Enzyme design. Structure first.
Site, PDB file in Angstrom:
ATOM      1  N   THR G   1       0.826  -1.201   0.000  1.00 36.25           N
ATOM      2  CA  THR G   1       0.000   0.000   0.000  1.00 36.25           C
ATOM      3  C   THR G   1       0.865   1.256   0.000  1.00 36.25           C
ATOM      4  O   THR G   1       1.512   1.574   0.997  1.00 36.25           O
ATOM      5  CB  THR G   1      -0.946   0.036   1.216  1.00 36.25           C
ATOM      6  N   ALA G  49     -10.302  -0.953   5.557  1.00 34.66           N
ATOM      7  CA  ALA G  49     -10.775  -0.953   4.176  1.00 34.66           C
ATOM      8  C   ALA G  49     -12.213  -0.457   4.084  1.00 34.66           C
ATOM      9  O   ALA G  49     -12.523   0.434   3.284  1.00 34.66           O
ATOM     10  CB  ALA G  49     -10.645  -2.353   3.580  1.00 34.66           C
TER      11      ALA G  49
END
EC number: 3.4.25.1
Lengths: 244, 240, 222, 231, 242, 195, 212, 243, 204
Positions: G1, G49
């Site tokens: 990420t 998320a």
């Protein structure tokens, strides 16, 4: 058909002003006459009590003089039932400001919190609005001495000298021609005493039936000192003025 | 109510609550304001005829909600101890949550929304005091002037007169004042306000309250010595 | 101590092609090393060519399917019987999943259907509750035995075209209905021997423009 | 006579007059005619509008696949009760995993309607409802009245000139009961009954709304050309 | 004058019947739904020249493709607009789809049909049931352009051409014969200004009146005073030629 | 971390707030304002857990500004520390503890004398001629007491701060990339960009 | 990420990756973490998320309410502060997340903010969030210029994510370069690292360790 | 005047006006009676048939609390079904904690909590129905009749409705038939005859025979509805008696 | 661990003949780090003097809460609160919230204005009734003053002789404690007069 105005006070009157407030004004005139005077050296408060003859002891009990703090003082003229609620309420709000901010509460903010209580009854619910009038006498470090008047409508205005009870407009006329910017503490005692005698049907006004209190700036280090004058000391005031 | 019903409508489509709420404004003090090009002038009428009144300790009828946004009402001062405090809380909340200076149109909806909420809520009445909301566009010099009515609605007005003798003063705003060519300077905007006040006022030192709001967070009250300055210019026209 | 979420097993595989989009999953339900039910259907039709299957704990998926049906049936009540697109129902599920975030439910939800353009679209729901548009995605403990294989025969990843060395790979080519079925049969058959939770028999639901067709395939019971 | 403005006071007649005032909304409202059998159930309702360009709003609300109803009366008192039945059908199909009974739905509506009328003030429900539904016991039609009474009939008619269709349903009752399994005979039977109640009003496809539900045929709203064959 | 639980002899409610006549005491709001769009118009009602017309509006925006119009008292109308805008972003979030115009009005009417004098059973936010009427206009991806009318006095209806307010009696008579299926966008805008000018004795200009329309391409777009004045001058050219 | 240091000189009050805000390991930004302006005569900083001190000084500033408009008078700095202590006293007794330190100082127009109050994360009002927070104050407590005197002017306090910051960054490995100094005197808030 | 953002005179260049990892096995390489509030603002996704997916859309519905009221384009400071107030009231109850508020308008110009679940708000220019955020500050600040063109900023953003996704095993997939213009957002297409890494080592000659 | 204006207010005559109007609401309706025997109780009530459109064995108003308590009312239909639905939640509360069927002597108090309170409170209108319930418990058979004013009493037999005056005189004749009370099947035949004699005012429309009994003989403490040949046996027997 | 032991501090009070003497230290600091050397624990209301130790934030918090209650008494009874009645006021305030108590060492002292008798008392974390005519001591360094103040105690001590008695034990206790020091103050109350003297010790 109809079935209104008989319960909730939120419904306006045909004259635009609630008749419940007009009937509260008549109860104020039935009470005594309290005349405050705002001066640079202090504030003078005097009133004539309703109870009479010899049976009630008037030395210890005073219903028209209550002390919120060493500076702010109030004069209660009106119904006692509606007044007692704001007495402990103002003491809570005044001490909460002294608790949180550690300072003496200003009169403008303190009365505004008390004015919304009288307004909240006419705003929400059908509860009775307070028809008692308070005379707020206090001292601040910014505007100095502040003197207001609590109306049953829920507002307040600044006043140098205000009078309640009977002869409200007649008392303000006598205090206008006698008003002075250099007026000292003793000068406000005699003029307020002579005006109260003419505006009331009782010219006697002994020492027990009359309550007298004056805030003086001439105390030690110019600090505000509220001295409650006992009726024994009030009797000596009539000797100095020559009325009795 | 015991067996009574509190729902009120009346066949005219206008409830008796608002009918008698506007009467308190007409029977109360008169208020007027004029929005100029570079400034907004808000006049206010107070009663000094009563004996021994102190102006400094008396709360001013013209309240400042924000640096560039002020407020002035006409009516009983009792209902103003609440509605004004609500707009002051929303003023600090708008600058906090949205990180935006107070919007004149958004704040007007909140002030008009308080009375709007009490009209639809039972057991409560709306405030019968009409407020005049005047503010500026954030990051802009364009002035804005709005009106708030006890009915819970707001309408935008460049010049408006409320209170006692409202329609009488409006005749002066339709002649001496022109919207197509409004007064550019500050003195010409005040002169129209002074001319509008003296009808129901007639001069006086403490009976005239005029707050001229200028951009860049500039607010100054009209001095007492400058009150008779515009009155003198009015008397010069009467001699001709 | 009460277990917040359990695992009964199971593997679901969504597949979306150039025209249709299918969905599959096994019938095997197990607890630890023992088999619970030999055939328990975990896959049902939610209407409007939308087939939803939840891979994860049972009652959490059961409470999700039962409340999703009442949400779709309520959607037609206020909208007076109007079709619900697959992209519209995908967002509304996360709102039901986030409301329970304080008591997390472990489920993997894969829905199949058709978009407004007619192409197959698969929206896979993570156990956290987030989702993203996915061409093909598997679920469960056997998802690692599936996902890298389908990218070879569908996306043609890391497979060069014969005749070109070190230049380009094989371009994307579309597969027919039977070719996708062979991808589903060979995926669970090889996973049957290599994974203890894959076996029994297979329920293949083919969602096309004409309707939804259900196909049964038999795996090894071991 | 103050008993018409107070719902908590017993009238000298013995029953509140506000209910009789609420019954006039059913007669002045839309006129609907319906009948059922041991297989299916048919409701024929009239749709009205306030202008020639105004569309005809559906008087039939679908609360279930196997259960539906039709409203004649005040607008607010109708859809509010429809959401209650919508939640009860989903409560029984979820918790009990069974369709809601027709008699249980009537008792729940009487307790909710009486709670507002018996209590001081409240929201009295003055709309009538004809509820049809299918279960293991067959088709059932329970007439909902604002007075708090729910009775199960083979069929009935409400609204203006309700006596015209009511007379036709009583003499033909023995014929409609023996006829089952045929949607053409049950739908056409309701067309001839409503024609007697309708006066100075033409029968078109947009004005009339026909819906049938049963074991073989689920609930379907027939609009436009769908009712052109039966009419 | 009667109670809340009391029914009229016709079967309706007094507060429902009496509130219907209060709509005709407001401003005239005229609108027409065509195949190319929904053209709306309003008459602000300026009683004084010192009344800013650009700041105030009788036409708000519920959604990008869904407009609205108000008539009468604008107080209770604004409370209904916030309820419609709240439900607008409510369904736009869950299903990510255009708001159904028929379902949006039904959700607003559910709150519009509740009222009472208060009670301890539930919360009472309604003193009187919305004596203001609103014109809901939007575009649907299924049935196309839809123009409804929010009625607190009963069930909402879909009008192809609707006119309310003080001129509701004389304007609706012309809407019957002047409306057909071949009406275009430009013909619908000129027909609203023509009928409004006939029923109202006040001169029609870009100040006292404001126009708006709903088009699927441009969404909700407020016509300014420049374009509004051009449509009025173009309408006068057709009136002098006929 | 998040050094905030201040000292009250004769004619004014010198307050310094850190610039760089380090989130976790990496430094996200090297320039940030860690202080909030209550009134033109009062300046207050904040330091503590990330996100708790940023939101804390906001509604405190809104309540002080709201109370000042009602009375048309600016709240005195002495009463500001009493209101902050009242909120910090309820924060530790609530379900969510809040550890926030503030340096509240300014020029009182009534007494015409400057004042400086030091408050730690415990929310205790303490008036001192100098103050700091974090692990950096330990070095500057004994140094300022040996040198600074009540007769020191403002210009000397700026050069003395340069000697302190130079020793703080040399002894301790942490680097704040400078501090933002704002002089608070009768003339109002005066920023200094030389640091 | 790896999620980075920076602004300059031309506008804002947003460079993120497509990789989302669950445990030691990458869940999907097609996952797009770019969230669109309004056409002029594009949000990121970090930490939780579902926390970023739900709250950024709820913030979008909140910004649409102000667009119907004030009728003004939502500023970057307006949407970022509302998000900071929602996460502060719920702090201590869990619900941890993170993102970067990015938008380009005419009134406030290009602006980028960082919002933390603890309620930390910050104003600045260059920001990066991720485990490979160290690679962004090294590569970007080398060629970073105020007059840097948008075309050269995209080429620098390609190798910035390439160097970040190289050593970091949690960053990868397809590089997403999205720029917000005066008229709105523009997608420049998905650029896979596998196809991008070949053109970089052959042309620029970087990554001397990798053969080729 | 304020006397008849608002309810729940005392009257100078000692009887509230709402009580007299509540009885008139009970008098208007069908005729409901009951018989308390030695082995159990028997309930009989008229079922009014408006037209042939009614479906039999549907609108029957008799509800059964558990298996041992039957319930029947005469009065407003919504108020009757509402009071029974309350007693169901009331009777279930006793069996929940104490795990034992509720006794009938104390069962009248659970229903009395709703009726006696609504007479005291103005905000809620009292029930306008007269409920006759009974059954057999461990303490023996019991039969009670609840008045709309909140009062109630036990009865060996009771009559309510329009025909309560003519039916009460007939119930007193059954006392002289047997000192210990009629049998289970013998009371059904005598109850139906009293029902058939009460249709003189109700002969304007059609009626349906409705009978339910609970005894210890055939049902052994269960409350069931008369069906099979027991229904036709009481019809033909009482039809020849009224001839 | 203990929030009261972090700030430290002690409050000692002794009796005499028509005289009371209460004293605390000036030291304020968190653990080994110091904060304020001028900090005063004892706050004066009327003739009642109450010192408080423990967390410094709550020293003012309860004092502002104690002043909230004591002011309401003077505005009604129109006289100062007595130390005997004020004792139960503190015990009821600390007991108001049992869960998560406040860490305080309060020791009250004073002379009654009506009866004219000396009274001293002390409390614990949640408050308690403690009456000893000899002395009352609290805090971390209080362990040193149990035997020192008792052996130095004599009936009917003069106000000046009592000053040197309480000061000698207080100065020796400051150097032997790491949480006590930075000077101290002693309040000598004869009748209407309060003698405030700052003790001179050897500071670090």
């Amino acid at each position: 058909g109809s079935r209104r105005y008989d319960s909730r006070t939120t419904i306006f009157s045909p004259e635009g002003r609630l008749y419940q407030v007009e009937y509260a004004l008549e109860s104020i005139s039935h009470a005594g006459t309290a005349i405050g005077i705002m001066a640079s050296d202090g504030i003078v408060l005097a009133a004539e009590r309703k109870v009479t003859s010899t049976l009630l002891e008037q030395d210890t009990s005073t219903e028209k003089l209550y002390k919120l703090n060493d500076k702010i003082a109030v004069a209660v003229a009106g119904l006692t039932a509606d007044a007692e609620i704001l007495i402990n309420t103002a003491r809570i709000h005044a001490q909460n400001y002294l608790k949180t901010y550690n300072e003496d509460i200003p009169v403008e903010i303190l009365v505004r919190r008390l004015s919304d209580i009288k307004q909240g009854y006419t705003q929400h619910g059908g509860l009775r609005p307070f028809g008692v009038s308070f005379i707020y006498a206090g001292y601040d470090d910014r505007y100095g001495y502040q003197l207001y008047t609590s109306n049953p409508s829920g507002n307040y205005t600044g006043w140098k000298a205000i009078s309640v009870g009977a002869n409200t407009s007649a008392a303000q006329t006598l205090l206008q021609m006698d008003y002075k910017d250099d007026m000292k503490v003793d000068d406000a005692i005699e003029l307020a005493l002579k005006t109260l005698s003419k505006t009331t049907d009782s010219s006697a006004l002994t020492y027990d039936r009359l309550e007298f209190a004056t805030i003086r700036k001439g105390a030690n280090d110019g600090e505000v000192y509220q001295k409650i004058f006992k009726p024994q000391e009030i009797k000596d005031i009539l000797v100095k003025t020559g009325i009795t | 109510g015991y067996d009574r019903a509190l729902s009120i409508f009346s066949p005219d489509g206008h409830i008796f609550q608002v009918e008698y709420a506007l009467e308190a404004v007409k029977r109360g003090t008169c208020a007027v304001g004029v929005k100029g090009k570079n400034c907004v002038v808000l006049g206010c009428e107070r009663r000094s005829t009563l004996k021994l009144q102190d102006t400094r300790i008396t709360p001013s009828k013209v309240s400042k909600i924000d640096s560039h946004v002020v407020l002035s009402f006409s009516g009983l001062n009792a209902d103003s101890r609440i509605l004004i405090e609500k707009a002051r809380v929303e003023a600090q909340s708008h600058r906090l949550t949205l990180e935006d200076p107070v919007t004149v149109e958004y704040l007007t909806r909140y002030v008009a929304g308080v009375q709007q909420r009490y009209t639809q809520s039972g057991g409560v009445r709306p405030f019968g005091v009409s407020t005049l909301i005047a503010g500026f566009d954030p990051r802009d010099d364009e002035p804005k002037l709005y009106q708030t009515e006890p009915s819970g609605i707001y309408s935008s007005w460049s010049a408006q007169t409320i209170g006692r003798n409202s329609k009488t003063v409006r005749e002066f705003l339709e002649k001496n004042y022109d919207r197509k060519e409004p007064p550019a300077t500050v003195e010409e905007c005040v002169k129209l306000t002074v001319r509008s006040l003296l009808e129901v006022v007639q001069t006086g030192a403490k009976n005239i309250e005029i707050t001229v709001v200028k951009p860049d967070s500039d607010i100054v009250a009209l001095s007492s010595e400058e009150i008779n300055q515009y009155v003198t210019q009015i008397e010069q026209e009467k001699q001709e | 101590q009460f277990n917040p979420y359990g695992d009964n097993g199971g593997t679901i595989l969504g597949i979306a092609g150039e025209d249709f989009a299918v969905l599959a999953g096994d019938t095997r339900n197990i607890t630890d090393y023992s088999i619970n039910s030999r055939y328990e259907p975990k896959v049902f039709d939610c209407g409007d060519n939308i087939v939803m299957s939840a891979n994860g704990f049972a009652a959490d998926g059961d409470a999700l399917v039962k409340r999703f049906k009442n949400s779709v049936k309520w959607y037609h009540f206020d909208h007076n019987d109007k079709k619900l697109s697959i992209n519209s129902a995908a967002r509304n599920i996360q709102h039901l999943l986030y409301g329970k975030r304080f008591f997390p439910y472990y489920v993997h939800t894969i829905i199949a259907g058709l978009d407004e353009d007619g192409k197959g679209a698969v929206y896979s729901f993570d156990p956290v509750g987030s989702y993203e548009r996915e061409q093909c995605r598997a679920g469960g403990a056997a998802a690692s035995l599936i996902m890298p294989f389908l990218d070879n025969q569908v996306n043609f990843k890391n497979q060069y075209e014969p005749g070109t060395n070190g230049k380009v790979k094989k371009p994307l080519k579309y597969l027919s209905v039977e070719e996708v079925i062979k991808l589903v049969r060979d995926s669970f058959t090889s996973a049957t021997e290599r994974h203890i939770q894959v076996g029994d028999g297979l329920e293949i639901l083919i969602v096309t423009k004409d309707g939804v067709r259900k196909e049964f395939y038999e795996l090894k019971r071991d | 006579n103050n008993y018409d403005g107070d719902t908590v006071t017993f009238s000298p007649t013995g029953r509140l007059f506000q209910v009789e005032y609420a019954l006039e909304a059913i007669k002045q409202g839309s006129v609907t005619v319906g009948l059922r059998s041991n297989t299916h159930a048919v409701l024929v309702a009239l749709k009205r509008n306030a202008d020639e360009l105004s569309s005809y709003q559906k008087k039939i609300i679908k609360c279930d696949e196997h259960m539906g109803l039709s409203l004649a009366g005040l607008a607010p008192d109708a859809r509010v009760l429809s959401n209650y039945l919508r939640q009860q059908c989903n409560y029984s199909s979820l918790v009990f995993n069974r369709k809601l009974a027709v008699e249980r739905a009537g008792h729940l509506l009487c307790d909710k309607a009486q709670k507002n009328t018996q209590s001081y003030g409240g929201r009295p429900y003055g709309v009538g409802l004809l509820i049809i539904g299918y279960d293991k016991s067959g088709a059932h039609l329970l007439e909902f009245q604002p007075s708090g009474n729910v009775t199960e009939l083979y069929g009935t008619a409400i609204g203006a000139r309700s006596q015209g269709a009511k007379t036709y349903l009583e003499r033909t009752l023995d014929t409609f009961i023996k006829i089952d399994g045929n949607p053409d005979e049950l739908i056409k039977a309701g067309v001839e009954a409503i024609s007697q109640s309708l006066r100075d009003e033409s029968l078109t496809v947009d004005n009339l709304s026909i819906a049938i539900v049963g074991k073989d045929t689920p609930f379907t709203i027939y609009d436009g050309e769908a009712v052109a064959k039966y009419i | 004058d009667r109670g809340v639980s009391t029914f009229s002899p016709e079967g309706r409610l007094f507060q429902v019947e009496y509130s219907l006549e209060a709509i005709k005491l407001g401003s005239t709001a005229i609108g027409i739904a065509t195949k190319e769009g929904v053209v709306l118009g309003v008459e602000k009602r300026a009683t004084s020249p010192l009344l800013e017309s650009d700041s105030i509006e009788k036409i708000v925006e519920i959604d990008r493709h869904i407009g609205c119009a108000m008539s009468g008292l604008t107080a209770d109308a604004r409370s209904m607009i916030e309820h419609a805008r709240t439900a607008a972003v409510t369904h736009n979030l869950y299903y990510d789809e255009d708001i159904n115009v028929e379902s949006l009005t039904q959700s607003v009417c559910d709150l519009a049909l509740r009222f009472g004098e208060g009670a301890s059973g539930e919360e009472r936010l309604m003193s009187r049931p919305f004596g203001v009427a609103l014109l809901i206009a939007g575009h649907d991806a299924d049935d196309g352009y839809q123009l409804f009318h929010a009625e607190p006095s009963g069930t909402f209806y879909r009008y192809n051409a609707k006119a309310i307010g003080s001129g509701s009696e004389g304007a609706q008579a012309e809407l019957l014969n002047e409306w057909h299926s071949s009406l275009t966008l430009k013909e619908a805008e000129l027909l609203v200004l023509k009928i409004l000018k006939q029923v109202m004795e006040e001169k029609l200009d870009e100040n006292n009146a404001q126009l708006s329309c709903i088009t699927k391409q441009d969404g909700f777009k407020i016509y300014d005073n420049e374009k509004t004045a051009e449509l009025i001058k173009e309408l006068k050219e057709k009136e002098a030629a006929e | 971390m998040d050094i905030i240091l201040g000292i009250r000189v004769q004619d004014s009050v010198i307050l310094a707030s850190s610039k760089a805000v380090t989130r976790g390991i990496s430094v996200l930004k090297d320039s940030d304002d860690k202080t909030r302006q209550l009134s033109p005569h009062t300046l207050m900083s904040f330091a503590g857990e990330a996100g708790d001190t940023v939101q804390f000084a906001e509604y405190i500033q809104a309540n002080i500004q709201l109370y000042s408009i009602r009375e048309d008078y600016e709240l005195s700095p002495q009463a500001v520390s009493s209101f902050v202590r009242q909120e910090l006293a309820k924060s530790i007794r609530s379900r969510r503890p809040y550890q926030v330190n503030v340096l509240i100082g300014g020029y009182d127009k009534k007494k015409n004398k400057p004042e400086l109050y030091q408050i730690d994360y415990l929310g205790t009002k303490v008036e001192l001629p100098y103050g700091a927070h974090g692990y950096s104050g330990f070095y500057t407590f004994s140094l300022l007491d040996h040198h600074y005197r009540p007769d020191m002017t403002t210009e000397e306090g700026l050069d003395l701060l340069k000697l302190c910051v130079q020793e703080l960054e040399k002894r301790m490995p942490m680097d704040f990339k400078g501090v933002i100094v704002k002089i608070v005197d009768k003339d109002g808030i005066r920023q200094v960009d030389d640091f | 990420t790896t999620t980075l953002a920076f602004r300059f005179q031309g506008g804002i260049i947003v460079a993120v990756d497509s990789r989302a990892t669950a445990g030691n096995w990458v869940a999907s390489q097609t996952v797009k973490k770019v969230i669109e509030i309004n056409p002029f603002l594009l949000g990121t996704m970090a930490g939780g998320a579902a926390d970023c997916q739900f709250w950024e859309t709820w913030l979008g519905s909140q910004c649409r309410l102000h667009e119907l009221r004030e009728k003004e384009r939502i500023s970057v400071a307006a949407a970022s502060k509302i998000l900071s107030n929602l996460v502060y009231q719920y702090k201590g109850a869990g619900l941890s997340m993170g993102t970067m508020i990015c938008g380009y308008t005419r009134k406030e110009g290009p602006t980028i903010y960082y919002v933390d679940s603890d309620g930390t708000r910050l104003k600045g220019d260059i920001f990066c969030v991720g485990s490979g955020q160290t690679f962004a500050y090294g590569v970007l600040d080398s060629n970073y210029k105020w007059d840097l063109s948008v075309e050269d900023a995209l080429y620098l953003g390609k190798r910035s994510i390439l160097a970040a996704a190289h050593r970091d095993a949690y960053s990868g997939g397809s590089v997403n370069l999205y720029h917000v213009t005066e008229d709105g957002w523009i997608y420049h297409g998905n650029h896979d690292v596998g196809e991008l890494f070949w053109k970089v080592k052959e042309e620029e000659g970087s990554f001397n360790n990798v053969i080729g | 005047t304020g006397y008849d204006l608002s309810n729940s207010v005392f009257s100078p005559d000692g009887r509230n006006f709402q009580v007299e109007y509540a009885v008139k609401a009970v008098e208007n309706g069908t005729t409901s009676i009951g018989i308390k025997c030695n082995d159990g109780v028997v309930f009989a009530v008229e079922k009014l048939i408006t037209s042939k459109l009614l479906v039999p064995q549907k609108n029957v108003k008799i509800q059964v609390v558990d298996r041992h308590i039957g319930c029947v009312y005469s009065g407003l239909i919504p108020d009757g079904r509402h009071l029974v639905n309350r007693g169901r939640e009331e009777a279930a509360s006793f069996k929940k904690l104490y795990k034992t069927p509720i006794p009938i002597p104390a069962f009248a108090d659970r229903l009395g909590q709703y009726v006696q309170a609504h007479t005291l409170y103005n905000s809620v209108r009292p029930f306008g129905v007269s409920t006759i319930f009974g059954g057999v418990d461990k303490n023996g058979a019991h039969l009670y009749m609840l008045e709309p004013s909140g009062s109630y009493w036990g009865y060996k037999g009771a009559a309510t409705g329009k025909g309560r005056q003519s039916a009460k005189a007939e119930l007193e004749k059954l006392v002289d038939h047997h000192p210990e009370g009629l049998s289970a099947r013998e009371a059904v035949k005598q109850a139906a005859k009293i029902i058939y004699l009460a249709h003189e005012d109700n002969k304007e429309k059609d009626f349906e025979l409705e009978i339910s009994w609970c005894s210890l003989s055939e049902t052994n403490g269960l409350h069931k509805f008369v069906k099979g040949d027991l229904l036709q046996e009481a019809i033909d027997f009482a039809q020849k008696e009224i001839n | 661990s203990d929030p009261s032991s972090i700030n430290g501090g002690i409050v000692v009070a002794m009796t005499g003949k028509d005289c009371v003497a209460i004293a605390c230290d000036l030291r304020l600091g968190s653990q080994s780090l110091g904060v304020s050397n001028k900090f005063e624990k004892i706050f004066h209301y009327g003739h009642v003097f109450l010192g408080i130790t423990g967390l410094a934030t709550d020293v003012t918090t309860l004092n502002e809460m104690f002043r909230y209650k004591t002011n309401l008494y003077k505005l009604k009874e129109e006289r100062a609160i007595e130390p005997e009645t004020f004792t139960q006021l503190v015990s009821s305030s600390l007991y108001e919230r049992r869960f998560g108590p406040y860490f305080v060492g309060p020791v009250v002292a004073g002379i009654n204005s009506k009866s004219g008798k000396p009274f001293i008392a002390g409390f614990d974390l949640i408050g308690c009734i403690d009456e000893a005519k000899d002395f009352i001591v609290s805090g971390t360094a209080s362990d040193q003053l149990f035997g020192m103040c008792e052996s130095l105690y004599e009936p009917n001590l003069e106000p000046e002789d009592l000053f040197e008695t309480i000061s000698q034990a207080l100065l020796n206790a400051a150097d032997r404690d790491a949480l006590s020091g930075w000077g101290a103050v002693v309040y000598i109350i004869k009748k209407d007069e309060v003698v405030k003297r700052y003790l001179k010790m050897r500071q670090d």
